[PDB]
Amino acid sequence: IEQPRWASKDSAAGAASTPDEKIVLEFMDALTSNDAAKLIEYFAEDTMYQNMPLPPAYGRDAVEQTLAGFFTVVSVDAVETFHIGSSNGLVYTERVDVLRALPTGKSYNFSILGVFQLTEGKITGWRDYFDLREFEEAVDLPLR
Amino acid sequence: IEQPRWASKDSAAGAASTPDEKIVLEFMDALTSNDAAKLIEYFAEDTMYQNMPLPPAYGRDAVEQTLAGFFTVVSVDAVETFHIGSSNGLVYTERVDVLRALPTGKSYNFSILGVFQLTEGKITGWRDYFDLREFEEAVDLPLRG
């Protein structure tokens, strides 16, 4: 994965400088685990996860079921975070995720800007904004 | 457009508190002008605009031609900015843009998280992340990606 022309050292992942930013990076590295059970430990009970604008999951159970489901048809092979930053209690990640569909073995590069809200070090909110034109094809589940 | 459940007042548009953040909100407001010539004045010579992951525009001329072309086929009917914030020289807008296709009159609500890099108050980079599944339909031009 190439680092973009527009990448800024000033906001590089290696320069994360808050407890919140550090946890989110750690959550990013954990994604390649494809382990809903390891990942849900990062979330608060009162929480949410959405791939905009698909139906969101509210509550830690729903988030766990949504993740478990994705990891059933899809592997997260790599996460490259170009930018991490934060403002007003929100953390932002500009990044690329490499996704591989399990039934097909086809790989995909999704350019993603995500926002995270954390309360007492745990995720109360997670929204990834990206193009879902291929996400349709990549995730062998109805986008519903 | 209603405020989503996840909207936080701490990061609301009304609470913008840096000159960069305020310039970006001004720029969001101006989008409904549908005027490439007025919008282009917000940009530095060395700039870029991209709707990920479509081919990017680099330089002021390309950005203006791009905007002008969009406004030939789409009106930006409304922009609601739920969140604005900034960090390490970047400004982020969490928002919805209402777009209307001119040939059909159909409307579309796009949920967008966008990043802006400003140098001396001018836009040196602008990247919007959102679902393009309907952007294809909405926009009566070939997408190039």
Side-chain angles (χ1 to χ4, degrees), chain A residues 86 94 127 129 131-133, chain B residues 87 94 127 129 132 136 145:
Chain A
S86 61
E94 194 165 15
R127 302 174 299 282
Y129 289 70
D131 179 14
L132 316 185
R133 280 179 309 166
Chain B
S87 176
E94 198 169 7
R127 297 176 302 276
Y129 293 70
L132 309 187
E136 301 205 296

Side-chain angles (χ1 to χ4, degrees), chain A residues 93-107:
Chain A
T93 68
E94 194 165 15
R95 78 181 197 266
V96 173
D97 293 6
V98 187
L99 255 45
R100 177 174 41 92
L102 299 183
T104 66
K106 177 158 175 202
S107 192

Side-chain angles (χ1 to χ4, degrees), chain B residues 2-3 11-12 21 41 43 73 86 109 111 113 119 123 133 138:
Chain B
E2 358 83 286
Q3 303 293 118
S11 204
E21 292 180 1
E41 293 305 294
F43 293 73
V73 293
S86 63
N109 303 326
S111 288
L113 181 51
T119 305
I123 300 173
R133 272 186 304 169

Side-chain angles (χ1 to χ4, degrees), chain A residues 5-6 10-11 54 58 83-88 90 94 111-113 115 127 129-133 136, chain B residues 5-6 10-11 58 83-88 90 94 111-113 127 129-133 136 145:
Chain A
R5 308 170 55 173
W6 47 257
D10 292 323
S11 210
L54 303 180
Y58 282 87
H83 298 143
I84 188 144
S86 61
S87 176
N88 302 327
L90 300 174
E94 194 165 15
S111 286
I112 297 168
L113 185 56
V115 58
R127 302 174 299 282
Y129 289 70
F130 58 108
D131 179 14
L132 316 185
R133 280 179 309 166
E136 289 255 36
Chain B
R5 293 164 66 172
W6 42 259
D10 299 330
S11 204
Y58 272 92
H83 293 153
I84 188 173
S86 63
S87 176
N88 310 316
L90 307 186
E94 198 169 7
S111 288
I112 295 164
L113 181 51
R127 297 176 302 276
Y129 293 70
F130 59 106
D131 181 9
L132 309 187
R133 272 186 304 169
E136 301 205 296

Side-chain angles (χ1 to χ4, degrees), chain A residues 109-111 130-131 133-134, chain B residues 50-56 128 130 132 144-145:
Chain A
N109 294 345
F110 298 103
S111 286
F130 58 108
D131 179 14
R133 280 179 309 166
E134 294 183 285
Chain B
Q50 185 175 12
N51 293 297
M52 318 299 294
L54 310 176
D128 276 346
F130 59 106
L132 309 187
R144 281 21 291 206

